[PDB]
Each structure stands twice: as structure tokens, then as C-alpha cells.
PDB file of N, CA and C in Angstrom:
ATOM      1  N   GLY A  24      -0.347   0.327  -6.575  1.00 46.14           N
ATOM      2  CA  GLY A  24      -0.843  -0.099  -7.363  1.00 46.14           C
ATOM      3  C   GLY A  24      -0.943  -1.974  -7.679  1.00 46.14           C
ATOM      4  N   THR A  25      -0.762  -1.907  -8.898  1.00 47.92           N
ATOM      5  CA  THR A  25       0.251  -3.064  -9.849  1.00 47.92           C
ATOM      6  C   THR A  25       1.008  -3.275 -10.596  1.00 47.92           C
ATOM      7  N   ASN A  26       1.464  -4.457  -9.607  1.00 46.59           N
ATOM      8  CA  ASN A  26       2.602  -3.948 -10.354  1.00 46.59           C
ATOM      9  C   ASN A  26       3.303  -2.895 -10.774  1.00 46.59           C
ATOM     10  N   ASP A  27       3.775  -2.563  -9.314  1.00 47.15           N
ATOM     11  CA  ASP A  27       4.322  -1.080  -9.131  1.00 47.15           C
ATOM     12  C   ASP A  27       6.130  -0.939  -9.289  1.00 47.15           C
ATOM     13  N   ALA A  28       6.341  -0.937 -10.694  1.00 46.69           N
ATOM     14  CA  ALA A  28       8.138  -0.590 -10.753  1.00 46.69           C
ATOM     15  C   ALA A  28       9.072   0.825 -10.505  1.00 46.69           C
ATOM     16  N   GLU A  29       8.626   0.861  -9.639  1.00 48.09           N
ATOM     17  CA  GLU A  29       8.481   2.179  -9.055  1.00 48.09           C
ATOM     18  C   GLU A  29       8.216   1.683  -7.492  1.00 48.09           C
ATOM     19  N   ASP A  30       9.618   2.818  -6.521  1.00 49.26           N
ATOM     20  CA  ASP A  30       9.069   2.135  -5.047  1.00 49.26           C
ATOM     21  C   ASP A  30       7.806   2.794  -4.634  1.00 49.26           C
ATOM     22  N   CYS A  31       8.407   4.693  -4.849  1.00 50.42           N
ATOM     23  CA  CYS A  31       6.894   5.441  -4.498  1.00 50.42           C
ATOM     24  C   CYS A  31       5.753   5.959  -5.220  1.00 50.42           C
ATOM     25  N   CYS A  32       4.626   7.001  -4.559  1.00 49.39           N
ATOM     26  CA  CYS A  32       3.610   6.947  -5.064  1.00 49.39           C
ATOM     27  C   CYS A  32       3.360   7.817  -5.828  1.00 49.39           C
ATOM     28  N   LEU A  33       2.263   9.064  -6.305  1.00 49.91           N
ATOM     29  CA  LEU A  33       2.448   9.599  -8.010  1.00 49.91           C
ATOM     30  C   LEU A  33       2.840   9.990  -6.789  1.00 49.91           C
ATOM     31  N   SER A  34       1.426  11.229  -6.577  1.00 49.05           N
ATOM     32  CA  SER A  34       1.599  12.170  -6.347  1.00 49.05           C
ATOM     33  C   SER A  34       0.319  12.580  -5.471  1.00 49.05           C
ATOM     34  N   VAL A  35      -0.436  13.420  -3.966  1.00 49.38           N
ATOM     35  CA  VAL A  35      -1.104  12.924  -3.252  1.00 49.38           C
ATOM     36  C   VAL A  35      -2.062  14.059  -3.660  1.00 49.38           C
ATOM     37  N   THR A  36      -3.337  14.006  -3.274  1.00 48.15           N
ATOM     38  CA  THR A  36      -4.773  14.937  -3.741  1.00 48.15           C
ATOM     39  C   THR A  36      -4.431  16.303  -2.947  1.00 48.15           C
ATOM     40  N   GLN A  37      -5.665  16.870  -1.818  1.00 49.19           N
ATOM     41  CA  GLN A  37      -5.984  17.767  -1.665  1.00 49.19           C
ATOM     42  C   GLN A  37      -6.108  16.711  -0.196  1.00 49.19           C
ATOM     43  N   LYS A  38      -6.634  16.189  -0.011  1.00 47.70           N
ATOM     44  CA  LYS A  38      -6.926  15.283   0.941  1.00 47.70           C
ATOM     45  C   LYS A  38      -7.201  14.097   0.937  1.00 47.70           C
ATOM     46  N   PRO A  39      -6.254  12.754   0.361  1.00 47.83           N
ATOM     47  CA  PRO A  39      -6.379  11.877  -0.405  1.00 47.83           C
ATOM     48  C   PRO A  39      -8.005  11.315   0.342  1.00 47.83           C
ATOM     49  N   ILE A  40      -7.587   9.677   1.935  1.00 49.10           N
ATOM     50  CA  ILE A  40      -8.329   9.845   2.483  1.00 49.10           C
ATOM     51  C   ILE A  40      -8.380   9.227   3.312  1.00 49.10           C
ATOM     52  N   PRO A  41      -9.352   8.714   4.280  1.00 51.35           N
ATOM     53  CA  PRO A  41      -9.726   8.498   6.413  1.00 51.35           C
ATOM     54  C   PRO A  41      -7.976   7.814   6.718  1.00 51.35           C
ATOM     55  N   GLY A  42      -7.445   8.202   7.416  1.00 53.24           N
ATOM     56  CA  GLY A  42      -5.743   8.166   7.818  1.00 53.24           C
ATOM     57  C   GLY A  42      -6.509   7.369   8.659  1.00 53.24           C
ATOM     58  N   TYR A  43      -8.296   6.584   8.765  1.00 50.56           N
ATOM     59  CA  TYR A  43      -8.434   5.579   9.971  1.00 50.56           C
ATOM     60  C   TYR A  43      -8.452   4.757   9.304  1.00 50.56           C
ATOM     61  N   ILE A  44      -8.536   3.953   8.182  1.00 50.76           N
ATOM     62  CA  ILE A  44      -8.771   3.035   6.364  1.00 50.76           C
ATOM     63  C   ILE A  44      -7.955   2.429   6.865  1.00 50.76           C
ATOM     64  N   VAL A  45      -6.027   2.730   6.813  1.00 50.49           N
ATOM     65  CA  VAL A  45      -5.568   2.502   6.245  1.00 50.49           C
ATOM     66  C   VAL A  45      -4.985   1.382   7.389  1.00 50.49           C
ATOM     67  N   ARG A  46      -4.537   0.459   6.397  1.00 53.40           N
ATOM     68  CA  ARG A  46      -3.632  -0.377   7.381  1.00 53.40           C
ATOM     69  C   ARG A  46      -2.167  -0.579   8.092  1.00 53.40           C
ATOM     70  N   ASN A  47      -1.764  -0.231   7.150  1.00 52.92           N
ATOM     71  CA  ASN A  47      -0.170  -0.380   7.102  1.00 52.92           C
ATOM     72  C   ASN A  47       0.308   1.273   6.146  1.00 52.92           C
ATOM     73  N   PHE A  48       1.405   1.680   6.534  1.00 52.85           N
ATOM     74  CA  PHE A  48       1.941   2.640   6.143  1.00 52.85           C
ATOM     75  C   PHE A  48       3.710   2.886   5.371  1.00 52.85           C
ATOM     76  N   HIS A  49       3.636   3.179   3.934  1.00 51.35           N
ATOM     77  CA  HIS A  49       5.201   2.924   3.595  1.00 51.35           C
ATOM     78  C   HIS A  49       5.386   4.421   3.777  1.00 51.35           C
ATOM     79  N   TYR A  50       6.319   4.987   4.150  1.00 52.78           N
ATOM     80  CA  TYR A  50       7.316   6.144   3.946  1.00 52.78           C
ATOM     81  C   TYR A  50       8.073   6.229   3.142  1.00 52.78           C
ATOM     82  N   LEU A  51       7.671   6.960   1.683  1.00 52.44           N
ATOM     83  CA  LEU A  51       8.393   7.226   0.805  1.00 52.44           C
ATOM     84  C   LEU A  51       8.972   8.946   0.979  1.00 52.44           C
ATOM     85  N   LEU A  52      10.272   9.161   0.492  1.00 51.96           N
ATOM     86  CA  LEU A  52      10.996  10.564   0.988  1.00 51.96           C
ATOM     87  C   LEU A  52      11.605  10.544  -0.212  1.00 51.96           C
ATOM     88  N   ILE A  53      12.379  11.995  -0.291  1.00 53.97           N
ATOM     89  CA  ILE A  53      12.912  12.353  -1.336  1.00 53.97           C
ATOM     90  C   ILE A  53      14.666  11.596  -1.025  1.00 53.97           C
ATOM     91  N   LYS A  54      15.091  11.022   0.825  1.00 52.20           N
ATOM     92  CA  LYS A  54      15.583  10.538   2.029  1.00 52.20           C
ATOM     93  C   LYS A  54      16.130   9.295   1.351  1.00 52.20           C
ATOM     94  N   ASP A  55      14.550   8.461   0.573  1.00 53.27           N
ATOM     95  CA  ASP A  55      14.972   6.922   0.243  1.00 53.27           C
ATOM     96  C   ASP A  55      14.831   7.274  -1.338  1.00 53.27           C
ATOM     97  N   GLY A  56      15.045   8.078  -1.597  1.00 50.10           N
ATOM     98  CA  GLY A  56      14.549   7.509  -3.692  1.00 50.10           C
ATOM     99  C   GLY A  56      13.587   8.276  -4.140  1.00 50.10           C
ATOM    100  N   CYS A  57      13.156   9.460  -4.127  1.00 49.32           N
ATOM    101  CA  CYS A  57      12.081  10.061  -5.099  1.00 49.32           C
ATOM    102  C   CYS A  57      11.803  11.793  -5.808  1.00 49.32           C
ATOM    103  N   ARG A  58      11.621  12.467  -6.577  1.00 48.95           N
ATOM    104  CA  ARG A  58      11.434  13.108  -5.928  1.00 48.95           C
ATOM    105  C   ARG A  58      10.273  13.518  -5.153  1.00 48.95           C
ATOM    106  N   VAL A  59       9.548  13.000  -5.697  1.00 49.03           N
ATOM    107  CA  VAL A  59       7.964  13.341  -5.164  1.00 49.03           C
ATOM    108  C   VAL A  59       7.620  12.303  -3.730  1.00 49.03           C
ATOM    109  N   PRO A  60       8.015  13.107  -2.125  1.00 47.19           N
ATOM    110  CA  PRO A  60       7.646  12.278  -0.918  1.00 47.19           C
ATOM    111  C   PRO A  60       6.637  12.191  -0.296  1.00 47.19           C
ATOM    112  N   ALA A  61       6.242  11.186  -0.308  1.00 46.27           N
ATOM    113  CA  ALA A  61       4.356  10.909  -0.008  1.00 46.27           C
ATOM    114  C   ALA A  61       3.982   9.833   1.170  1.00 46.27           C
ATOM    115  N   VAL A  62       3.868   9.824   1.954  1.00 46.13           N
ATOM    116  CA  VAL A  62       3.530   8.435   2.195  1.00 46.13           C
ATOM    117  C   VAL A  62       2.013   7.315   2.263  1.00 46.13           C
ATOM    118  N   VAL A  63       1.912   6.624   1.513  1.00 49.35           N
ATOM    119  CA  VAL A  63       1.226   5.402   1.241  1.00 49.35           C
ATOM    120  C   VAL A  63       0.821   4.956   2.261  1.00 49.35           C
ATOM    121  N   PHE A  64      -0.365   5.713   2.148  1.00 46.47           N
ATOM    122  CA  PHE A  64      -1.898   4.395   2.696  1.00 46.47           C
ATOM    123  C   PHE A  64      -2.064   3.577   1.941  1.00 46.47           C
ATOM    124  N   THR A  65      -1.825   2.083   3.323  1.00 46.48           N
ATOM    125  CA  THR A  65      -2.300   1.235   1.878  1.00 46.48           C
ATOM    126  C   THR A  65      -3.787   0.627   2.672  1.00 46.48           C
ATOM    127  N   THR A  66      -4.793   1.509   2.674  1.00 48.10           N
ATOM    128  CA  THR A  66      -6.087   0.072   3.180  1.00 48.10           C
ATOM    129  C   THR A  66      -6.392  -0.661   3.764  1.00 48.10           C
ATOM    130  N   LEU A  67      -7.399  -0.722   3.937  1.00 46.40           N
ATOM    131  CA  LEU A  67      -8.657  -2.109   4.063  1.00 46.40           C
ATOM    132  C   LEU A  67      -8.706  -2.436   2.834  1.00 46.40           C
ATOM    133  N   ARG A  68      -8.765  -2.314   2.123  1.00 45.78           N
ATOM    134  CA  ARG A  68      -8.568  -3.308   0.520  1.00 45.78           C
ATOM    135  C   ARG A  68      -7.506  -3.982   0.089  1.00 45.78           C
ATOM    136  N   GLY A  69      -6.134  -2.741   0.737  1.00 45.64           N
ATOM    137  CA  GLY A  69      -4.918  -3.651  -0.290  1.00 45.64           C
ATOM    138  C   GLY A  69      -5.024  -2.512  -0.796  1.00 45.64           C
ATOM    139  N   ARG A  70      -5.006  -1.485  -1.059  1.00 48.39           N
ATOM    140  CA  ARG A  70      -4.623  -0.265  -1.854  1.00 48.39           C
ATOM    141  C   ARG A  70      -4.039   1.239  -1.215  1.00 48.39           C
ATOM    142  N   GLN A  71      -3.120   1.342  -2.107  1.00 48.64           N
ATOM    143  CA  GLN A  71      -2.136   1.983  -2.035  1.00 48.64           C
ATOM    144  C   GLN A  71      -2.220   3.586  -2.255  1.00 48.64           C
ATOM    145  N   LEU A  72      -1.617   5.068  -1.388  1.00 49.89           N
ATOM    146  CA  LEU A  72      -2.689   5.567  -2.013  1.00 49.89           C
ATOM    147  C   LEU A  72      -1.440   6.706  -1.507  1.00 49.89           C
ATOM    148  N   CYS A  73      -1.621   8.288  -2.061  1.00 48.75           N
ATOM    149  CA  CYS A  73      -0.725   8.835  -1.662  1.00 48.75           C
ATOM    150  C   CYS A  73      -1.037  10.026  -0.874  1.00 48.75           C
ATOM    151  N   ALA A  74      -0.088  10.220   0.310  1.00 46.93           N
ATOM    152  CA  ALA A  74      -0.955  11.537   1.484  1.00 46.93           C
ATOM    153  C   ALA A  74       0.401  12.227   1.408  1.00 46.93           C
ATOM    154  N   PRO A  75      -0.005  13.849   1.588  1.00 46.84           N
ATOM    155  CA  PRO A  75       1.359  14.751   2.450  1.00 46.84           C
ATOM    156  C   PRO A  75       1.684  14.235   3.769  1.00 46.84           C
ATOM    157  N   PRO A  76       2.581  13.877   3.430  1.00 45.47           N
ATOM    158  CA  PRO A  76       3.688  13.642   4.467  1.00 45.47           C
ATOM    159  C   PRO A  76       4.570  15.546   5.327  1.00 45.47           C
ATOM    160  N   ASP A  77       3.694  16.306   4.746  1.00 50.17           N
ATOM    161  CA  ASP A  77       3.833  17.515   5.706  1.00 50.17           C
ATOM    162  C   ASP A  77       2.510  17.956   6.614  1.00 50.17           C
ATOM    163  N   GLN A  78       1.377  17.572   6.068  1.00 52.03           N
ATOM    164  CA  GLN A  78       0.191  17.935   6.874  1.00 52.03           C
ATOM    165  C   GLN A  78       0.331  17.728   8.601  1.00 52.03           C
ATOM    166  N   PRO A  79      -0.513  18.039   9.242  1.00 53.46           N
ATOM    167  CA  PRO A  79      -0.261  17.005  10.565  1.00 53.46           C
ATOM    168  C   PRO A  79      -1.493  16.694  10.237  1.00 53.46           C
ATOM    169  N   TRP A  80      -2.623  16.664   9.963  1.00 54.22           N
ATOM    170  CA  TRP A  80      -3.408  15.663   9.886  1.00 54.22           C
ATOM    171  C   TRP A  80      -2.828  13.825   9.568  1.00 54.22           C
ATOM    172  N   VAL A  81      -1.585  13.612   8.826  1.00 50.59           N
ATOM    173  CA  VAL A  81      -1.070  12.594   8.054  1.00 50.59           C
ATOM    174  C   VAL A  81      -0.335  11.658   9.557  1.00 50.59           C
ATOM    175  N   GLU A  82       0.399  13.176  10.095  1.00 53.92           N
ATOM    176  CA  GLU A  82       1.285  12.655  11.057  1.00 53.92           C
ATOM    177  C   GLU A  82       0.921  12.027  12.339  1.00 53.92           C
ATOM    178  N   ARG A  83      -0.475  12.271  12.589  1.00 54.72           N
ATOM    179  CA  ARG A  83      -1.381  11.781  14.332  1.00 54.72           C
ATOM    180  C   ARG A  83      -1.481  10.525  13.115  1.00 54.72           C
ATOM    181  N   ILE A  84      -1.784  10.198  12.325  1.00 57.78           N
ATOM    182  CA  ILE A  84      -2.174   8.817  11.798  1.00 57.78           C
ATOM    183  C   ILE A  84      -1.128   7.397  11.727  1.00 57.78           C
ATOM    184  N   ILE A  85       0.161   8.037  11.452  1.00 58.16           N
ATOM    185  CA  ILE A  85       1.082   7.907  11.128  1.00 58.16           C
ATOM    186  C   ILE A  85       1.552   7.132  12.574  1.00 58.16           C
ATOM    187  N   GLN A  86       0.951   7.959  13.635  1.00 55.71           N
ATOM    188  CA  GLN A  86       2.042   7.865  14.931  1.00 55.71           C
ATOM    189  C   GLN A  86       0.676   6.064  15.684  1.00 55.71           C
ATOM    190  N   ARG A  87       0.078   6.599  15.085  1.00 53.99           N
ATOM    191  CA  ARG A  87      -1.290   5.482  15.846  1.00 53.99           C
ATOM    192  C   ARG A  87      -0.835   3.990  14.989  1.00 53.99           C
ATOM    193  N   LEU A  88      -0.147   4.356  13.577  1.00 54.56           N
ATOM    194  CA  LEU A  88       0.040   2.602  12.559  1.00 54.56           C
ATOM    195  C   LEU A  88       1.466   2.245  13.331  1.00 54.56           C
ATOM    196  N   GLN A  89       2.455   3.901  13.774  1.00 53.11           N
ATOM    197  CA  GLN A  89       3.469   3.124  14.377  1.00 53.11           C
ATOM    198  C   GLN A  89       3.500   1.924  15.274  1.00 53.11           C
ATOM    199  N   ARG A  90       2.536   2.748  16.016  1.00 54.78           N
ATOM    200  CA  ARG A  90       2.314   2.252  18.036  1.00 54.78           C
ATOM    201  C   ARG A  90       1.373   1.002  17.972  1.00 54.78           C
ATOM    202  N   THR A  91       0.796   0.549  16.557  1.00 50.91           N
ATOM    203  CA  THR A  91      -0.074  -0.743  16.257  1.00 50.91           C
ATOM    204  C   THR A  91       0.350  -1.903  16.269  1.00 50.91           C
ATOM    205  N   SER A  92       1.767  -1.000  14.345  1.00 48.59           N
ATOM    206  CA  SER A  92       2.474  -2.013  13.969  1.00 48.59           C
ATOM    207  C   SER A  92       3.765  -2.597  15.191  1.00 48.59           C
ATOM    208  N   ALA A  93       3.961  -1.966  15.457  1.00 46.07           N
ATOM    209  CA  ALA A  93       5.247  -2.122  17.098  1.00 46.07           C
ATOM    210  C   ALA A  93       4.884  -2.991  18.015  1.00 46.07           C
ATOM    211  N   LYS A  94       3.669  -3.685  17.639  1.00 43.93           N
ATOM    212  CA  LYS A  94       3.113  -5.202  19.044  1.00 43.93           C
ATOM    213  C   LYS A  94       3.965  -6.084  17.737  1.00 43.93           C
ATOM    214  N   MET A  95       4.419  -5.801  16.459  1.00 40.57           N
ATOM    215  CA  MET A  95       5.189  -6.875  15.850  1.00 40.57           C
ATOM    216  C   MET A  95       7.093  -5.859  15.772  1.00 40.57           C
ATOM    217  N   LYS A  96       7.477  -6.594  16.883  1.00 38.94           N
ATOM    218  CA  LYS A  96       8.535  -5.989  16.499  1.00 38.94           C
ATOM    219  C   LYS A  96       9.676  -6.847  15.401  1.00 38.94           C
ATOM    220  N   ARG A  97       8.972  -7.973  15.094  1.00 42.25           N
ATOM    221  CA  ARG A  97       9.641  -8.777  14.084  1.00 42.25           C
ATOM    222  C   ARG A  97       8.993  -8.604  12.175  1.00 42.25           C
ATOM    223  N   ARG A  98      10.250  -7.769  12.105  1.00 42.96           N
ATOM    224  CA  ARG A  98      10.156  -7.490  10.338  1.00 42.96           C
ATOM    225  C   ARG A  98      11.213  -7.617   9.685  1.00 42.96           C
ATOM    226  N   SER A  99      10.430  -8.991   9.250  1.00 41.54           N
ATOM    227  CA  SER A  99      10.881  -8.725   7.241  1.00 41.54           C
ATOM    228  C   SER A  99      10.600  -8.232   6.303  1.00 41.54           C
ATOM    229  N   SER A 100       9.625  -7.804   6.561  1.00 41.46           N
ATOM    230  CA  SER A 100       9.567  -6.968   5.201  1.00 41.46           C
ATOM    231  C   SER A 100       9.606  -5.466   5.503  1.00 41.46           C
TER     232      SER A 100
END
């Protein structure tokens, strides 16, 4: 969102947003360090939203973004 004092998301809704309108995602887990594991979907507008990392619908769209972002192997961010 605007001024994020934390690295993780808030909470995900039933079925947040279409996974095809997401530009890039950030995969937030408790492994990283947070109480709420969620993948944030950075939409076309540049807004990130919390989506369920367990649900199958998410794991497909993640792959799509992984393979498209993989085109850029140099990652500074």
C-alpha cells in the first residue's frame, strides 16, 4: 500500500483479485517472518493485495509470473 512499515500483507479475502491482472508478486510466508502468510499481487495499477498461497488458483498464476519475470535474470530488487 502506501508507506508500508511492514513487509508482509494484511489478510486475504475469499478470492481476492484476478491473477491475470497482476504484474508482479511478492511471496510472503512465515519463513520470511510474519504471522500471516500470503502472496501479494501487485496489480496493473501498482496495488498489492493479499491472496491465498495455499489455494490452487494462486499457484498457477504464480508460475506464470515466475516464467515471465525469469526473462529478466538480473534482479537487483
